[PDB]
RNA sequence: CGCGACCUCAGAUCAGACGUGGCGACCCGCUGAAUUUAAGCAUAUUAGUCAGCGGAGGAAAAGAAACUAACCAGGAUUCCCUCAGUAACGGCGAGUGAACAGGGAAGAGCCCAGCGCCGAAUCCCCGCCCCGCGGCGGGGCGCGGGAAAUGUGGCGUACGGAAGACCCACUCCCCGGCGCCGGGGGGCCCAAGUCCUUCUGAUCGAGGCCCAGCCCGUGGACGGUGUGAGGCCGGUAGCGGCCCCCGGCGCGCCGGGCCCGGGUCUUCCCGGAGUCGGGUUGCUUGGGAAUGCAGCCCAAAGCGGGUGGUAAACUCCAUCUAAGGCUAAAUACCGGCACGAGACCGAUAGUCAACAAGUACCGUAAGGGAAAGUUGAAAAGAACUUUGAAGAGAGAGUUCAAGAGGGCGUGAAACCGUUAAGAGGUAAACGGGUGGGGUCCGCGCAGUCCGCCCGGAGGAUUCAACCCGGCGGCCGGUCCGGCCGUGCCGGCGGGGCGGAUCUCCCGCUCCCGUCGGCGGGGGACCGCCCCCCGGCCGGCGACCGGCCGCCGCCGGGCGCAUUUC
RNA sequence: GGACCAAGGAGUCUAACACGUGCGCGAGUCGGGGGCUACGAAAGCCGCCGUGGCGCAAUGAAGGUGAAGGCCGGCGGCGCCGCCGGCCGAGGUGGGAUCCCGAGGCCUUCCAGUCCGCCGAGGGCGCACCACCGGCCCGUCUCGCCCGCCGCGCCGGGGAG
RNA sequence: UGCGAGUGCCUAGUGGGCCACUUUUGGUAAGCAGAACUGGCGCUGCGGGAUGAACCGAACGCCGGGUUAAGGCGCCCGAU
RNA sequence: UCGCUGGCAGUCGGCAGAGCGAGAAAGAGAGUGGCGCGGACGCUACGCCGCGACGAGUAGGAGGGCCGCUGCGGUGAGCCUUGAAGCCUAGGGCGCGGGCCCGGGUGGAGCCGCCGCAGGUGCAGAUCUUGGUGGUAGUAGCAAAUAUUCAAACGAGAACUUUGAAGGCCGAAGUGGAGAAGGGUUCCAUGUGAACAGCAGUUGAACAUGGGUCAGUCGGUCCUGAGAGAUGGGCGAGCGCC
RNA sequence: CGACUCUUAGCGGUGGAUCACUCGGCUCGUGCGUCGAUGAAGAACGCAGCUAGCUGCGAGAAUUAAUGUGAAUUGCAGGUUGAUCAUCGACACUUCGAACGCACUUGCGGCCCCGGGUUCCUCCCGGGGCUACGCCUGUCUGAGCGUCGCU
């Protein structure tokens, strides 16, 4: 807010006596705004309680190592069909979930043939769902240039641009990501993992160079390796109903007293 | 999506620049589509309205197929008056009803040197655009 | 008022610190402006190095840092005349000069002289008049092969 | 006495110029508090801050060491990170508080006076001729007039310089005009549904448009249009188009300005005073036996002077050269001209001001300073009859709606009118327990179904079994084949990464093609990784294919009625 | 304090510190300043951009110094130090969650004996932590005797309490 | 005889008190002023003392049945 | 609520065999010799289930909110001109409560649930701020300076306007006639009766239309007074001052 | 029964909350970064057919010229060889104001030149151009028992 809002006027308390309430009053004169209450948050006019300042802590810092950890987590969760379904993408007719296409796609330059490619890959139901989900935003976002809202469509990861962005920029919901500049803000909208991504063959080949393997460090990071697992076999039922554990157990007591 | 860093997507700015436009901008804003045969023969899609163009009303209470000649283009209210779109006042005077030019299709233009110049310029620009596209 | 065990602090907030608070909201804009100006300079000097003239090897002064080397201000007059470049010609061909710097020992002198001579052997001199080559010019074969180099002209590595 | 120079000093509506005042967000120079904190208060803090005065620019100021240091030394200024809440200051209380070095942004250096040498080699103005001209300059001509020896110009400035002599090298500089070749400002244009059916007062809504899931899309930002539009319109996208004007980097021509360098030796030349410094006083600083500034007194030197964070003497070192001047960049910007955006406010909010707002209004004045947005899609703003003096009513009419009638969107509460119901001598209201009466609801008014079996009437293409085809789930004690390993073992295997593990060539420096030394390249070795070959192990339940076997399901035949439904 | 009603109305933001929780890496960690590549003023990268901050070492006003020892064998001046060479080599006591061993024993006719599982008197190696005893580093005090050499000195070093 | 113990951090509010049986100082005395021990009120409702901060009983989630405490049983008003 | 830091992965099913509550440690142990195709529910493990004891509270502390408000990122092939937000309701209900969901009416263009994020986020008070409305109450009051009556006219309308008559007052230091300061069109005429003139009005200093101020000889202009104020000069950091 | 009072509900008033809107603010960022004696900022007064305020303009006064554009403006009237808008480089720009002939009533002047008076003979009238302070370079006219030289 203006740092001088509500402090323009000259005003002072009438004091005790006068049968008024010791708040500052506007100095005299034959107007409505006269002896009326000027300073303080409770008055009509005057400042507010704590005038918001511009030097609030607006930006936050996070460690690079866990930036990379989260981006790896998002990529890992993007390749499990149940998680994409839970996120809501229509992928019931996708051939294989880590959907990778030929490098010739990177040379497209027409939105019509981009749409044809989506039709062939059977990912068009998601764009139709985005179309169905376009509507007006509720509240005072209307009059602040955020009038219209819609749903996130599938993302497309490319290695080198040769018109792929020109082709896919016009289709709603589609976002384009260079493989070497991945970001969590677009690979996990709303903080939720499992966005439906369509890869290009070159980008898919280059991904393990970017992030390294379990035994090989990243080739184009300064010093980065994949994060370790706290537990390797996460399937709990298989562990529990195994002969080794079933052997060293007492008999269950499931009779209710 | 708009990419020019010098034009506004700002709602209030657009409404201000529309409701406080000068007359020579009002003229461009008040444009109407040409009919099918006219657009096919002139290779032009839209055209600003003039005082003596014959038109059809497409939307509203008066939508129909009859032809009406514009009688005046009142650009301060962004309206035009067609000579048989009118209603009856309480006393008995007949009064025109204003129709926005965008809900009106032109069936016969009036042509002079400036009109022909504008039509040929628009047609040439469209043709070179198609040639560049193909 | 002091409380249970804690640290006793001295905040320097008793002046009017709020009437002068320097925020950094224009930091990205300043970075973009600086790099645009840098590119404009780099392409206004067409074949010349982007980082500017060559600079000599320097020891850091104090005991804390006297084991490292870095880049200096300019080549001194003594090493410049040992190498054989003229005072007024060094900086017109691309050699930084400062007349304030001494030369106490001989190894640093000789290292700077070697650097200067190697740079002189390396540089390519265009003709003053494009169709009129002269004695000290470079030939057309490397005139067609000349280009800019990025970063420091000869990185100083310890 | 007069006349004539010069020096000082006047007067002009003399000829031609220049300053004043405004704004003031950022900057430069003075002046300069007190609230406040110290739980009192006087030094200290607030604070070199508010207020006051003066002066600019598009930035200003600063700036090329009378520097930092004590190292193996750095090298103009300015800004950022750190140094650092540190050394230091402080009723040593409260509190205050830098700099060097290191890493970056930017990077650029120069000119006088003085000492000297060149016949004042210098500059200004008037008149005339030619050229150019909206930045008043170029050439020529004047026995034209002045400034200047009480010092103009050329060379030249601490990094040394000048002259002479000898060697080597050199004619690629600049500007004033003219013409020619390839960013900014303005103007006008450039895709596709008003398709069929159907809601509505109005559609931009709803459904559809095939086997091309209507058409465009490098254009699905936005705004308008009678609700809610990628295709109705303006725009949006495009290294898209066309038309004018201005500048630059380029080119050629004309003309003018200068006849200019480097190395070696010899001989000469070499600097800024009421200033530095000292005493004292006052302010200031972290600067403490005095950091900086100023007043007054004293008052310099030339191997001198300044500095080297404790006063002084003596003695060696180090490092600069004051008392003259100019200088872009990086840096600041709540005023101004344009712009773009927002996890901001939404008419008691947001600027005081969304509106005829610094307006009305109050004060002698300095100054103080409001309230105030919304009919409807479109005025279609209620013709006409009637009562009344009129306001104001009754009809009539417009509109989808007057239950929107000119302060008119929605229309809450306090308060009031009327209608209906109920009640009423301990003010009223309230908690717990019932009872009575009302208003509505149950769509209450003969009251649950759900499986299995028995019996009776029915009606079907009908059950079990068998055959043909498809799919699926589990296996093969050890079927065959693959793929993987955050596994291993080999290798007469082919590579990338790294190494504070070792050792042929090149470059450099010092030595009469030579010895020894420095930088790099090459080679070997080691570790890791990737790939090819071979062999074990594990998996195929984040990761399977085929044949066989079993089982299940579906479809089709065949089943023909004590079955099945 | 309060006639009544509506709207507004008061622990916020910055910086510092302390502790507790959650995440990543871990004797390291952190680019925040700089640089390179519509939303995007975001995001990504740099490692010879880790300069630097905090941590990894303390103590003294300062000059400064700066964090185990014992045994064997003989000698020089019983022991002790050094020359030596080798060997062991980084505390002890009590209490300690858990782990290890195991006298024996857990039935379907009776005996012998196998495997697996289990319980278990008693005995052990002992985490973190607590208490205590020793030991080592810096300052200081008291008492002492030796060693070193480029300069044998108003020198340097060492011991016990 | 009864009971699971030890131990470490960070921490708000408070720092005007008052009353009663027995002990007790000043004062003629005080619903006065000042102490000791225990329990209360403040922070606490409930049955009785007609009425009451501290008196007697008894301490509290929302309910049904039963029985009691202190105090009561002519009528108000449950119970001779 | 707390404790038991109790129980449940055993839904082990024709590849089957239904158990783990019972005073007193530990095997529903393995082996070596002597037809009919069938079997409820469950377990968002941050869930479900079983026993015990307990429940006062100001200052203060902590936990849980599928309590509530505004905005952002996700998501509901969410809702809506066949009716959103808002508002009213003797209508039906849920929740211990904060609150919420349906029905009816009015209204006419937008809104909400879930997972996270952010905050100018919940009012009964502050002689709180602004706006509005009551009882008081048709009450107090419309009492300083002697005074009015009759007839007519106009007018829809007369205690108050105008005309005439009558009776009074001011009483020449006036309730008269004229100027200065100040006011600024109030002056004059015509018309109107919404608002104002504290009753009313046919009237008005109200409102609306138009009009109206003439100079050699009245004043200013000219003079100087008490005083004010430049230049020369001085002082002054400076605006400037003396 | 009725009046009066109290509660609840319907409708109607008073009042203008809530909800939805928004040509306005606030904050951040970018580019530029420009006043004045050739008369600024500010102020006063005037200008429209019907016009108070706001806006625009200056006696050429809700604008002239020129260029672009290309048929309107509009509340009511009136009458394409270019209406209206925008741009804006030509022209114009009242009185004060640093404010400049002296003072600030708008009063009083002086000088030169035109046109009336005149027939320059002066007055009188109208118009035009000058008439501020400081300061610089040069010019002219000067001053000094200041320093001299010739007489
Ligand atoms: Mg405000
Ligand atoms: Mg809302
Ligand atoms: Mg405290
Ligand atoms: Mg003159
Ligand atoms: Mg001072
Ligand atoms: Mg104090
Ligand atoms: Mg105090
Ligand atoms: Mg005091
Ligand atoms: Mg004091
Ligand atoms: Mg101070
Ligand atoms: Mg100031
Ligand atoms: Mg000035
Ligand atoms: Mg300026
Ligand atoms: Mg400067
Ligand atoms: Mg300077
Ligand atoms: Mg110098
Ligand atoms: Mg420095
Ligand atoms: Mg520190
Ligand atoms: Mg200070
Ligand atoms: Mg530095
Ligand atoms: Mg740099
Ligand atoms: Mg000279
Ligand atoms: Mg729209
Ligand atoms: Mg449709
Ligand atoms: Mg559409
Ligand atoms: Mg649209
Ligand atoms: Mg279009
Ligand atoms: Mg278009
Ligand atoms: Mg464009
Ligand atoms: Mg001080
Ligand atoms: Mg000293
Ligand atoms: Mg000097
Ligand atoms: Mg200097
Ligand atoms: Mg942006
Ligand atoms: Mg309002
Ligand atoms: Mg307001
Ligand atoms: Mg309002
Ligand atoms: Mg409102
Ligand atoms: Mg309001
Ligand atoms: Mg309204
Ligand atoms: Mg309605
Ligand atoms: Mg309405
Ligand atoms: Mg209304
Ligand atoms: Mg009522
Ligand atoms: Mg009644
Ligand atoms: Mg009161
Ligand atoms: Mg901690
Ligand atoms: Mg007492
Ligand atoms: Mg109390
Ligand atoms: Mg208690
Ligand atoms: Mg009690
Ligand atoms: Mg009693
Ligand atoms: Mg009971
Ligand atoms: Mg009794
Ligand atoms: Mg409780
Ligand atoms: Mg509407
Ligand atoms: Mg907010
Ligand atoms: Mg409220
Ligand atoms: Mg309230
Ligand atoms: Mg009365
Ligand atoms: Mg009365
Ligand atoms: Mg009276
Ligand atoms: Mg009189
Ligand atoms: Mg009179
Ligand atoms: Mg009158
Ligand atoms: Mg009246
Ligand atoms: Mg004076
Ligand atoms: Mg009610
Ligand atoms: Mg409203
Ligand atoms: Mg007018
Ligand atoms: Mg014109
Ligand atoms: Mg024109
Ligand atoms: Mg006067």
Contact (CB, 8 A) for A75 and A107: no
Question: Which of A107, A198, A120, A193 has the alpha carbon at shortest distance from A154?
Answer: A198
To the nearest whole angstrom, how far is the Cα of A150 from the nearest Cα of chain B?
15
A and B touch with 3+ CB pairs <8 Å, answer: yes
Structural determination approach:
cryo-EM
Residue B64 vs residues B88, B101, C11, C67: alpha-carbon distances, Å = 19, 15, 81, 94
Question: A residues 126-155 near B, CB within 8 Å?
Answer: 143, 145, 147
CB contacts of A55 in chain C (<8 Å) are: 21, 23
The two tokens of residue B7 are: 């034009």
Beta strands in B1-134 (DSSP E): 31-33, 46-48, 54-57, 68-74, 79-82, 86-88, 94-96, 104-108
Give CA–CA dist C91/C97, Å, rounded: 7
Query: Where are the alpha helices (H) located in C22-106, listed in sequence order?
Result: 27-44, 77-83, 87-93
Beta strands in C24-150 (DSSP E): 57-59, 69-71
**Residue B11 to residue A169, Cβ atoms within 8 A:** no
Per DSSP, chain C holds a count of helices (H) and strands (E) of 5, 2
Contact (CB, 8 A) for A130 and A185: no
To the nearest whole angstrom, how far is the Cα of A144 from the nearest Cα of chain B?
8
Give CA–CA dist C35/A82, Å, rounded: 46
The two tokens of residue B94 are: 């007949």
Could you tell me if residue A237 is left (phi over 0), alpha (psi between -120 and 50 degrees) or otherwise beta? alpha
> A2 alpha carbon to ligand 13 midpoint, in Å?
29
Question: Which of B31, B71, B76, B37 has the alpha carbon at shortest distance from B54?
Answer: B71
Does the beta carbon of A54 lie under 8 angstroms from any beta carbon of chain C? Answer: yes
Q: Which of residues 63-82 of A touch strand D (CB under 7 A)?
A: 76, 80
Contact (CB, 8 A) for A103 and A200: yes
Residue C43 vs residues A166, C51, C150, C154: alpha-carbon distances, Å = 29, 12, 12, 20
Give CA–CA dist A99/B15, Å, rounded: 45
Task: Give how far the C-alpha of residue A51 lies from the chain's centroid of Cα atoms, to the nearest Å.
Answer: 30
A114/D453 CA-to-C1' distance in Å: 67
Check if residue C139 sits with its Cβ under 7 angstroms from strand F.
Answer: no
- Identify the chains in contact with B, defined as 3+ C-beta pairs within 8 A: A
Q: Which residues lie below 8 Å from residue B26, measured CB to CB, with a gap of 6+?
A: B75, B78
Does the beta carbon of A169 lie under 8 angstroms from any beta carbon of chain B? Answer: yes
Q: Containing H/E element for A156?
A: strand A155-158
Q: Which residues lie below 8 Å from residue A157, measured CB to CB, with a gap of 6+?
A: A177, A178, A179, A182, A197, A198, A199, A200, A203
CB contacts of A143 in chain B (<8 Å) are: 11-12
Q: Give the three-class secondary structure for A230.
A: coil
Q: Which residue is it, tokens 């645009």?
A: C36
Q: Give the three-class secondary structure for A250.
A: coil
Question: Which of B11, B12, B18, B16 has the alpha carbon at shortest distance from A148?
Answer: B11
The two tokens of residue A227 are: 């994060």
- Identify the chains in contact with A, defined as 3+ C-beta pairs within 8 A: B, C
Task: Give how far the C-alpha of residue A253 lies from the chain's centroid of Cα atoms, to the nearest Å.
Answer: 48
Check if residue C129 sits with its Cβ under 7 angstroms from strand D.
Answer: yes
Contact (CB, 8 A) for A122 and A99: no
Integer Rg of chain B from CA: 17
The two tokens of residue C128 are: 């003053």
Give CA–CA dist B101/B59, Å, rounded: 11
Residue A203 vs residues A72, A156, A160, A165, A173: alpha-carbon distances, Å = 15, 10, 8, 15, 21
**Residue A145 to residue B1, Cβ atoms within 8 A:** no
Mutate to test the interface with A, among B1, B3, B9, B11 (most CBs of A within 10 A): B11
Size of interface A-B (CB pairs under 8 A): 7
Check if residue C5 sits with its Cβ under 7 angstroms from strand F.
Answer: yes
A180/H108 CA-to-C1' distance in Å: 91
B117/F70 CA-to-C1' distance in Å: 117
């Amino acid at each position: 807010v203006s740092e001088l809002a509500g402090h323009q006027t000259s005003a002072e308390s009438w004091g005790t006596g006068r049968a008024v309430a010791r708040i500052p009053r506007v100095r005299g004169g034959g107007t409505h705004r006269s002896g009326q209450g000027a300073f303080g948050n409770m008055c009509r006019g005057g400042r507010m309680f704590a005038p918001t300042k511009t030097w609030r802590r607006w930006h936050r810092r996070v460690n690079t190592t866990q930036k990379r950890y989260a981006i790896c987590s998002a990529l890992a969760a993007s390749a499990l069909p149940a998680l994409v379904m839970s996120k809501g993408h229509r992928i019931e007719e996708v051939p294989e979930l880590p959907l990778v296409v030929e490098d010739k796609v990177e040379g497209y330059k027409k939105t019509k043939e981009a749409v044809l490619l989506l039709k062939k890959l059977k990912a068009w139901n998601d764009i139709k769902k985005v179309y169905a989900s376009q509507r007006m935003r509720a509240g005072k976002g209307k009059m602040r240039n955020r009038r219209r809202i819609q749903r996130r469509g599938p993302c497309v990861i490319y290695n080198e641009d040769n018109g792929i962005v020109k082709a896919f920029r016009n289709i709603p919901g589609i976002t384009l990501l260079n493989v070497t500049k991945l970001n969590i803000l677009k690979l996990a909208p709303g903080g939720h993992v499992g966005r439906f991504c369509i890869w290009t063959e070159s980008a898919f080949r280059k991904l393990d160079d970017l992030y390294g393997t379990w035994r090989k460090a990243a080739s184009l990071k300064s010093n980065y390796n994949l994060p370790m697992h706290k537990m390797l076999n996460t399937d709990l039922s298989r562990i529990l109903k195994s002969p080794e554990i079933q052997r060293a157990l007492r008999a269950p007591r499931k009779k209710i007293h | 999506m708009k990419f020019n860093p010098f034009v506004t997507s700002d709602r209030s700015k657009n409404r201000k620049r529309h409701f406080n436009a000068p007359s020579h901008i009002r003229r461009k804003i008040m444009s109407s589509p040409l009919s099918k045969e006219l657009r096919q023969k002139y290779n032009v899609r839209s055209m600003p309205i003039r005082k003596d163009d014959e038109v059809q009303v497409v939307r509203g209470h008066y939508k129909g197929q009859q032809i009406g000649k514009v009688v005046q283009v009142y650009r301060k209210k962004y309206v035009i008056y067609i000579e048989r779109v009118q209603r009856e006042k309480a006393n008995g005077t007949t009064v025109h009803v204003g129709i926005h030019p965008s809900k009106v299709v032109i069936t016969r233009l009036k042509l002079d040197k400036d009109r022909k110049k504008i039509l040929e310029r628009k047609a040439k620009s469209r043709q070179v655009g198609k040639e560049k596209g193909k | 008022a002091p409380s249970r065990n804690g640290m006793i602090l001295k905040p320097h907030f008793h002046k009017d610190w709020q009437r002068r608070v320097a925020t950094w909201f224009n930091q990205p804009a300043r970075k973009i402006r600086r790099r645009k100006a840098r590119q404009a300079r780099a392409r206004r000097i067409a074949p010349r190095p982007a980082a500017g003239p060559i600079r000599p090897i320097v020891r850091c002064p104090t005991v804390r840092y006297h084991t490292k080397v870095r880049a200096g201000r300019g080549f001194s007059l003594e090493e410049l005349r040992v190498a054989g470049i003229h005072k007024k010609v060094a900086r017109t061909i691309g050699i930084s000069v400062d007349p304030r710097r001494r030369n106490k020992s001989t190894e640093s002198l000789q290292a700077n002289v070697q650097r200067l001579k190697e740079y002189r052997s390396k540089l390519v001199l265009f003709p003053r008049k494009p169709s009129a080559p002269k004695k000290g010019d470079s030939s057309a074969e490397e005139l067609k092969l000349a280009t800019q180099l990025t970063g420091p002209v000869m990185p100083i590595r310890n």
